[PDB]
Amino acid sequence: VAKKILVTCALPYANGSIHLGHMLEHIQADVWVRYQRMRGHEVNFICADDAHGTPIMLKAQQLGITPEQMIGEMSQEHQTDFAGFNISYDNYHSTHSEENRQLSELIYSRLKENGFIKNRTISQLYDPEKGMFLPDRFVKGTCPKCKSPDQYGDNCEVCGATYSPTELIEPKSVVSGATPVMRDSEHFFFDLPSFSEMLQAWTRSGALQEQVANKMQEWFESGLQQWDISRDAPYFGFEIPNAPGKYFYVWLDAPIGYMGSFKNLCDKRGDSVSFDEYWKKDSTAELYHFIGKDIVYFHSLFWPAMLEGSNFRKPSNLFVHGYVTVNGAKMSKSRGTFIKASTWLNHFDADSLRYYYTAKLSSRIDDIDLNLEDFVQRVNADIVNKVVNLASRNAGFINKRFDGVLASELADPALYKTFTDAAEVIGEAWESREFGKAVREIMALADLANRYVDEQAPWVVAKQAGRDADLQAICSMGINLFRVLMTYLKPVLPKLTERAEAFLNTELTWDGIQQPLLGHKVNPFKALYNRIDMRQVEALVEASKE
Ligand SMILES: [Zn+2]
């Protein structure tokens, strides 16, 4: 029937700009969400900025502005980039909100009551001048192995040795320049180990990608550990109830952002029933998290345990994707392959990237390679020469010789059925996240549509006397095939689809393809998409280098 679906994307860190690596996740989720909406389901697409943490607090101080101001600006920047790529979020919030505070306290309270919170005193390097414990990377020093100066954290970039910051020669606090010292502090831990049996049964209930369920097996074998969920002041975040000086570490408050953002959305809509409908233990609504492979452990073990422990429903499934490489290698700042979302939009449109990523995506966790050379060729070849060409080639004749009126019947009903029959396969491909497959199927159909037009040679029929009817039937057949193709691609290319709809004078819906456009008036044709040059790509890389 009509499902209730809540989809999220991992929360971007407020202390950084969105790059093409991040876009892969958001575009993958958006394509899936747009398809689900097209099928009539109730979909809620949610996200938010991860805005707490010592790093955030320090960068803000270093800059002279308040963290509240810093994260506020980063939030607008991120939202501008996502809007630019047409990521159709129903709501984009922040972990730094009243909703998140309330939910973090509620969940913490329940976990504590149920006895899943443990106290443990730990020892950590402390900056006595600033009065704050120091995370490993905030301690500078001389490597005890090779004696190289200015080595940070727990590893040396020179000899590559690893060690505890307490082994550094002349340790110095990066925050004040003071010499750190050891110091004790009581911390709160989440008893993840007490959920192992439940998590095992849950993971075995056939949900996760084969590759995910397999990594989980190794994690169980190794054994689960308790996780620290507290931090000491000074800190930028929410204070733990009944624990003055203690704050919620990100492990806890970041994923709550998924809930906080949804609650914020319900409040905005004046909806007092949905939150519980979606998050209560016996919910029949579906919850999906689109995440990267680097945060699977957290979302598959810690997150569901926390939810279970606080009496909330667990995710229905986790959709994991791999990383993005450019030209076969990790993004490179020196090579100008480290491309930011905002930079990309200064040179190309969002539809091009959305199409390329989609054509390469699948239900597997494999890495996605953005080959710039291949990108230009794929876009020009597929979008411009196969799909858009189908419309432009036939639009002229219809607009100039028939007043934009399409024929009253299908020239080839059998060929049309071939295109609508494919809906089943393409729809299941979109649904199962086999995007590359959906695109292959669609392009196969596009080749077919172009072959039909080639064989009918309208530019030839257009020259023969007493063949006006034939010309109209042929060109109208081509426009109707284009109608179907654009429908299958609607989830992928939002802007191109709008321009297509303006031309066809119709809104494209999934079920609408069963009813071809007959005796229908299309609008004067206008370039739907233009070819891109390799020079455009070179300018982007140069711009990224700089
Ligand atoms: Zn060294």
Q: Ligand 1 centroid vs 176 CA: distance in angstroms? A: 24
- β-sheet bridge partners, residue 49: 94
Same-domain status, 149 and 29: no
Of 253, 257, 215, the closest CA to residue 237 belongs to 253
Determine the structural domain holding residue 454 and report its residue range.
387-524
Does the annotation place 47 within a ligand binding site? no
Annotate 307-326 with DSSP letters as a single string.
HHHTTBPPPSEEEEE--EEE
Residue 158: which CATH number? 2.20.28.20
Q: Tell me if 351 sits within 8 A of 378, measured CB to CB.
A: no
Does the annotation place 156 within a ligand binding site? yes
Cα–Cα dist 199/215, whole Å: 13
Same-domain status, 48 and 114: yes
Q: Ligand 1 centroid vs 177 CA: distance in angstroms? A: 21
Same-domain status, 269 and 329: yes
Domain boundary among 323, 353, 386: 386
Q: Ligand 1 centroid vs 133 CA: distance in angstroms? A: 25
Same-domain status, 428 and 366: no
Same-domain status, 167 and 218: no
Q: 177, exposed or middle or buried, with CB in 10 Å at 0-12, 13-18, 19+?
A: exposed
Beta strands in 34-138 (DSSP E): 42-49, 91-94, 117-127, 132-133
Does the annotation place 333 within a ligand binding site? yes
Q: Ligand 1 centroid vs 65 CA: distance in angstroms? A: 36
Collect all residues with Cβ–Cβ distance below 8 Å to 156 and sequence separation of at least 6. Answer: 143, 145, 146, 148, 162, 163
Q: Tell me if 188 sits within 8 A of 298, measured CB to CB.
A: no
Cα–Cα dist 542/28, whole Å: 27
Cα–Cα dist 535/528, whole Å: 21
Domain boundary among 386, 421, 439: 386
Annotate 414-453 with DSSP letters as a single string.
HHHHHHHHTHHHHHHHHHTT-HHHHHHHHHHHHHHHHHHH
Q: Give the CA count within 13 Å in the CB-facing half-sphere of 92.
A: 21
Is 530 part of any domain? Answer: no
Per DSSP, helices labelled H in 64-97 are: 67-84
Domain count, the chain: 3
Residue 413: which CATH number? 1.10.730.10
Query: In the structure encoding, which two tokens stand for residue 409, read together?
Result: 């019947």
What angle (nearest 5°) sits at the alpha carbon of residue 450, between those of residues 445 and 452? 95
Cβ-count burial 246-279 (b if 16+ within 10 Å, e if not): bbbbbbbbbbbbbbbbbbbbbeeeeeeebbeebb
Is 539 part of any domain? Answer: no
Q: Ligand 1 centroid vs 142 CA: distance in angstroms? A: 8
Is 379 part of any domain? Answer: yes
Q: Tell me if 163 sits within 8 A of 144, measured CB to CB.
A: yes
Is 73 part of any domain? Answer: yes
Is 77 part of any domain? Answer: yes
Does the annotation place 146 within a ligand binding site? yes
Q: Ligand 1 centroid vs 220 CA: distance in angstroms? A: 35
Same-domain status, 169 and 182: no
Cα–Cα dist 132/233, whole Å: 7
Q: Tell me if 384 sits within 8 A of 392, measured CB to CB.
A: no
Is 268 part of any domain? Answer: yes
Cβ neighbours, 10 Å, residue 166: 16
Of 345, 320, 258, 319, the closest CA to residue 20 belongs to 345
Is 544 part of any domain? Answer: no
The torsion of the CA quartet 359, 362, 368, 371, rounded to 10 degrees, works out to: -20
Collect all residues with Cβ–Cβ distance below 8 Å to 525 and sequence separation of at least 6. Answer: 391, 392, 395, 396, 399, 503
Q: Ligand 1 centroid vs 54 CA: distance in angstroms? A: 27
The torsion of the CA quartet 282, 287, 291, 295, rounded to 10 degrees, works out to: -10
Is 433 part of any domain? Answer: yes
Domain boundary among 156, 173, 190: 173
Q: Ligand 1 centroid vs 338 CA: distance in angstroms? A: 28
Peptide bond into 255 cis (omega under 30): no
Q: Ligand 1 centroid vs 336 CA: distance in angstroms? A: 29
Residue 83: which CATH number? 3.40.50.620
Same-domain status, 153 and 198: no
Q: Ligand 1 centroid vs 146 CA: distance in angstroms? A: 4
Helix axis angle for 435-456 and 389-401, nearest 10°, is: 40
Cα–Cα dist 27/15, whole Å: 21
Same-domain status, 331 and 382: yes
Q: Ligand 1 centroid vs 474 CA: distance in angstroms? A: 73
Tell me 232's DSSP state. Answer: E
Does the annotation place 266 within a ligand binding site? no
Same-domain status, 204 and 315: yes
Same-domain status, 437 and 511: yes
Q: 394, exposed or middle or buried, with CB in 10 Å at 0-12, 13-18, 19+?
A: buried
Q: Ligand 1 centroid vs 126 CA: distance in angstroms? A: 23
- β-sheet bridge partners, residue 340: 19
Q: Ligand 1 centroid vs 143 CA: distance in angstroms? A: 5
Same-domain status, 223 and 332: yes
Of 8, 91, 1, 6, the closest CA to residue 40 belongs to 1
Q: Ligand 1 centroid vs 141 CA: distance in angstroms? A: 10
Q: Ligand 1 centroid vs 38 CA: distance in angstroms? A: 57
Same-domain status, 288 and 409: no
